[PDB]
């Protein structure tokens, strides 16, 4: 990977463009057949509510899955950053 | 393709998001090794100047090449639409 680094670059870029994301802290992506399954942690504003942070995570899931068709599973969690 | 239809979808989407593009009229993409070479026609406003249309074409080239790393050659021309 090769194939995978270009997919990981697209995942990070997609995520970082979602309102309220303060960087991708962690991303692990793996092939399951031809499909990608991935697990991500994003940074968020410490003073966002838990509800808002969950909304940002959901918006990242939608953006990333929408942009990268091969992704068939994506978990997104959040940590306070900056 | 398989591989290629997903690349063509990304090309069209990238192009259509550039200011002043009125649809992708034509796209031919081919693999040269692992690289993509492509030829595209976009629609533009008939009342744009030739200079403006050339600027839109150049902006499409930049956007598409920037978004799809495997593309190593992209020609973009314009036709009046709508
Ligand atoms: Cl591919």
Curated annotation (Swiss-Prot), chains A, B:
Induction of synthesis: Part of the probable 17 gene mamAB operon.
Domain of life: Bacteria
Gene Ontology MF annotations: metal ion binding; monoatomic cation transmembrane transporter activity
Residues holding Fe cation 2: 54
Region (C-terminal domain (CTD)): 5-82
Residues at which Fe cation 1 binds: 39, 75
Nucleotide-binding found in the keyword field: no
Subunit structure: Forms homodimers via its C-terminal domain (CTD) in the presence of metal cations. Interacts with MamB via their CTD. Isolated CTD forms homodimers.
Protein name: Magnetosome protein MamM
Natural source organism: Magnetospirillum gryphiswaldense (strain DSM 6361 / JCM 21280 / NBRC 15271 / MSR-1)
Section of the entire sequence shown: 215 to 292 of 318
């Amino acid at each position: 990977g090769s194939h995978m680094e270009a997919v990981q670059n697209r995942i990070v870029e997609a995520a970082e463009r979602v309102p309220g994301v303060r960087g991708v802290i962690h991303l692990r992506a793996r092939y399951v057949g031809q499909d990608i399954w991935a697990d991500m942690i994003i940074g968020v504003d410490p003073e966002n509510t838990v509800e808002q942070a969950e909304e940002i995570c959901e918006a990242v899931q939608a953006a990333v899955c929408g942009k990268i068709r091969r992704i068939e599973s994506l978990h997104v969690s959040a940590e306070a950053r900056e």
